[PDB]
Structure formats: structure tokens, C-alpha cells
Write a protein that binds this ligand. Structure first.
Ligand SMILES: N[C@@H](Cc1c[nH]c[nH+]1)C(=O)O
Ligand SMILES: N[C@@H](Cc1c[nH]c[nH+]1)C(=O)O
Ligand code: NI
Length: 465
């Protein structure tokens, strides 16, 4: 009727907002701040804020906002939500170095111990979305947010059912119900769309784009965005030496991957960050060189008779990753590396066992809110939430720590580029492509978001005509 069916990759376990960005994506939860369609930070739940000095953030919340259970969004509710998320999630904790929070009425004051200029930016992170900590339901199954669609039922790792919250603060939402089901295989997501089992899908495989564009019942939307595919190394395994990481870096053919695997919907990568960001100084592009890789591997004693063995993990959710793994395996054999590819259904859970993998295909949104700090703190610091391979170098740590208290924006750019230059020498990961996000829908579905941060999808204006 006005019911919308969505098919997404990357199944979740908990759907607490501090465990996954899914509740923000599907319209259930909202953070204090957001980014707009051009990627700039804006107030969302906040009416006004001020920073009287470099350790104090004063916020006044909007006065007309309710949670989906009818409770008012007050400063006390925001305090308890943020404190709970800090306690329950390392990602949230390491992004928000908050020393205290005080609340009265609609006003809250957030303090830090020292200057952290990216604090407001990180309050736009979907993992910091606000939920009602006093709700008498399990936040891991049916959290209660302020968004336009309330989660009514969750079948773990399979299906989320949401219903219109009529008193949504920005206006009455335009759909009656949304059903989200997980499907990891992109070809299956496309088949579900073509058969009308689903109405909106994300992460469309590039080789299906033409088939969908050809269909007059469907439409495809693409956004270049800020997501990077990569080969991530497990630094806790002593065999993954600098020579080995450099060898693998030279077996990748980034230009060929962008042209033939992504069919032009990606550009070859050097650093984590898309080269379209104008202040980023990218390292030199590595061109494939099998002879160089063989020479590097000989440094550690590997030969055709005694090759390096690598267990490489992959997953289906981002559909080009496993196509890249196959061609890495074929080419690596020419350089005396035998790669065994293991495709897994739950990538984040699988990689927690650091004895079970040598390298993994991976993807990540490296600059979702306009600053490089988030990525460096989460991917290049020990215990950072996306640093699955435990990369850490004290010299890089020092620069990241300096960046965190640096207010002057041009100085932040300079330190960021120094971190890129120093870290690149270690080959912490091999960044492969800056690739577009491709979303497809039935033509009757209108006003979903396909914007550069790669997080938002559903809002109170999304509809079916
Ligand atoms: N960060 C990886 C793996 C992941 C699973 N769920 C969320 N992320 C990706 O987005 O492709
Ligand atoms: N799937 C999102 C969010 C995430 C957090 N951790 C892993 N993934 C991304 O890769 O950017
Ligand atoms: Ni992810």
C-alpha cells in the first residue's frame, strides 16, 4: 500500500544504535547533529549550541521532539543516552572523550579535559544516535528513537519491521510500514528488486547496473561518495612483514580493477581518502609489478618451491570485493604466494579471531563527516574499532594525538598529510579503489537519500507514488 520493502547487505546481531548505523539508515534513530546533502555538519535535534571555551559545549535542544513511545526528548534523556553508548561501545567511547555532562530542562553542557575540535562532528556519528534509556524494551532488539519509523519487531540477523511514528517532529512520515530484510549476495538483491519482492536495494553489483537501467519499472542512483575498498593486513601475525605487505601491494593492479571489475564506477586508490578531497596529498600510485613482488618475497625466503601461504577472507556484502580476491589469487601465484580464499557470512564477527586470518578484503567509509581524524583514531590506533588487523606505530600515534587537539584547520590538514605520508611507508593496508555507492529502486519509490556520507537512506519524506 504505502509499505516499503528494503533489502540490505551486512546483517546485524544487535541493532542498538551504538552497535550499528542501521537504525539511522532506516529512519528509526537520529543523532544530535547530521550532515546535509553536501556533506556539511548541521544541527538536527539541537536548536542552538555554543562553545564558550575549548573544553565546553553548551547545547539547547529543540522543545518540540518526542521519542516514538511519546516521551519528551529532554536534556536528561540525551545525557543518559550518550553515557550509555559510551559505556557500551568502544567506537563511541574513543570518538567522544567527554569528561562530564550536566543537564536541566532542554539545556545540556558537555565538558572535555582538553581541546577536542572534532567533538561536534562526532556527535553527528550515527553510532551516537539518541534512544530512550528508560524504555521498557531491549535496546538490542527494539530501541526507541526519535526517527520517523519505530522498530516494532526484529528477527535477529534477518528482518526488521517498522511502523510510521505519526508524531515525528519534522512532519508526518509518508509511509505506513517499512520491512528491511538482509541479503548478502548482490545478485540476489537485484533479483528481489526485479521480481518486486523488494522495492529499494543498496550496493548494487556493477555488472547489473545496465540491466536495471534498461528496466523501465526500476531506476538506479549512483553517488561517488567516500567509501574505499582495501586489502587489510593482520599485523599480529609475524609472517605479515613489511616485505610481504609491499609484495601484495604490488600484485594488485588498481587501474585494471577500476576499469574492469568496477567498470568505471571507481578510481584507483592510494591513501584511505578519495583524491577528490582537495587538501589531501596522496601517496604515489602503486602500479602492478609481479617481478618486484617476487623480489620482495625473496627477502623473507619465499620461492616457487617454498611459497608464502596466505589465508584471505572475503564477504559478499560489497559485491566487488570477492571478484578482486579472485584476481589477487590468480596473479599472486605468479609471485610465489598461494592464497586460500575463505568467504564468510559475518565479517565483523569472523575477524575478531586474529588467529583465523592473514589478510581480509574490506571496505570502509573513511571520511563521513568531513574530517580525517575519525578514520585515524578508529583505524590506525590500537583498539580503534575498525583496526581489525591491529596496526600500530608509535610515530603515527604521536601525530594522531597531536591532530586531536589541533584547532587550526590548515594545521589539521598539514598534520593529516604527515600522517598519510608516514603511515603509507608501513603499508598498514593496501587501499584499492574509491568506489561509488549504487542504489536501485522501483520507479515508484521517491525521495530516499543517496548522499556522499553513505549512511542515510530513509527519512520522513521518502514515499511511494
Ligand atoms: N566495514 C565493512 C564490514 C561491515 C559489516 N557491517 C558493517 N560493516 C563494510 O562496511 O563493508
Ligand atoms: N558499515 C559502515 C559502518 C561501520 C563501522 N564499523 C564497520 N563498519 C562502514 O564501513 O563505514
Ligand atoms: Ni562497515
Amino acid at each position: 500500500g504505502k509499505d516499503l520493502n528494503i533489502s540490505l547487505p551486512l546483517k546485524t546481531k544487535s541493532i542498538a544504535p551504538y552497535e550499528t548505523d542501521v537504525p539511522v539508515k532506516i529512519g528509526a534513530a537520529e543523532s544530535l547533529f547530521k550532515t546535509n546533502d553536501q556533506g556539511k555538519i548541521e544541527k538536527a535535534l539541537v536548536k542552538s549550541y555554543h562553545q564558550p571555551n575549548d573544553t565546553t559545549l553548551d547545547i539547547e535542544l529543540k522543545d518540540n521532539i518526542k521519542f516514538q513511545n511519546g516521551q519528551k526528548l529532554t536534556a536528561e534523556k540525551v545525557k543518559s543516552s550518550l553515557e550509555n553508548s559510551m559505556k557500551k561501545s568502544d567506537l563511541v567511547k574513543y570518538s567522544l572523550p567527554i569528561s562530564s555532562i550536566t543537564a536541566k530542562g532542554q539545556k545540556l553542557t558537555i565538558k572535555t579535559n582538553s581541546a577536542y575540535p572534532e567533538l561536534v562532528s562526532e556527535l553527528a556519528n550515527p553510532f551516537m544516535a539518541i534512544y530512550d534509556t528508560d524504555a521498557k524494551s531491549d535496546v538490542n532488539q527494539t530501541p526507541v528513537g526519535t526517527g520517523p519509523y519505530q522498530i516494532k519487531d526484529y528477527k535477529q540477523s534477518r528482518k526488521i519491521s517498522l511502523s510510521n511514528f505519526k508524531d515525528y517532529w519534522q512532519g508526518k512520515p509518508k509511509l505506513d510500514h517499512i520491512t528491511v530484510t538482509y541479503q548478502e549476495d548482490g545478485n540476489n538483491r537485484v533479483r528481489n528488486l526485479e521480481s518486486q519482492k523488494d522495492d529499494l536495494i543498496t550496493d548494487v553489483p556493477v555488472n547489473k547496473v545496465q540491466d536495471i537501467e534498461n528496466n523501465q519499472n526500476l531506476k538506479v542512483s549512483k553517488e561517488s561518495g567516500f567509501r574505499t575498498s582495501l586489502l587489510m593486513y593482520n599485523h599480529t601475525n609475524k609472517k605479515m612483514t613489511k616485505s610481504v605487505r609491499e609484495a601484495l601491494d604490488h600484485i594488485i593492479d588498481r587501474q585494471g580493477i577500476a576499469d574492469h571489475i568496477y567498470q568505471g564506477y571507481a578510481k584507483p586508490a592510494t591513501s584511505p581518502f578519495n583524491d577528490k578531497i582537495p587538501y589531501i596529498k596522496e601517496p604515489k600510485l602503486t602500479k602492478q609489478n609481479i617481478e618486484q613482488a617476487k623480489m620482495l618475497l625473496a627477502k623473507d625466503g619465499y620461492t616457487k618451491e617454498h611459497p608464502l601461504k596466505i589465508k584471505l577472507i572475503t564477504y559478499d556484502g560489497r559485491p566487488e570485493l570477492s571478484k578482486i580476491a579472485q584476481v589477487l589469487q590468480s596473479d599472486a601465484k605468479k609471485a610465489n604466494i598461494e592464497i586460500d580464499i575463505k568467504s564468510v557470512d559475518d565479517i565483523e564477527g569472523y575477524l575478531k579471531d586474529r588467529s583465523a586470518w592473514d589478510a581480509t578484503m574490506y571496505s570502509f567509509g573513511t571520511i563521513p563527516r568531513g574530517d580525517t581524524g575519525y578514520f585515524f583514531n578508529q583505524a590506525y590506533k590500537k583498539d580503534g574499532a575498525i583496526n581489525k588487523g591491529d596496526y600500530n606505530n608509535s610515530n603515527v600515534d604521536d601525530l594522531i594525538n597531536q591532530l586531536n587537539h589541533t584547532v587550526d584547520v590548515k594545521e589539521r590538514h598539514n598534520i593529516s598529510n604527515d600522517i598519510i605520508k608516514l603511515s603509507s611507508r608501513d603499508v598498514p593496508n593496501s587501499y584499492i579503489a574509491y568506489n561509488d555507492q549504487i542504489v536501485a529502486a522501483n520507479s515508484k519509490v521517491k525521495n530516499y537519500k543517496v548522499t556522499p556520507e553513505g549512511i542515510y537512506l530513509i527519512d520522513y519524506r521518502t514515499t511511494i507514488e
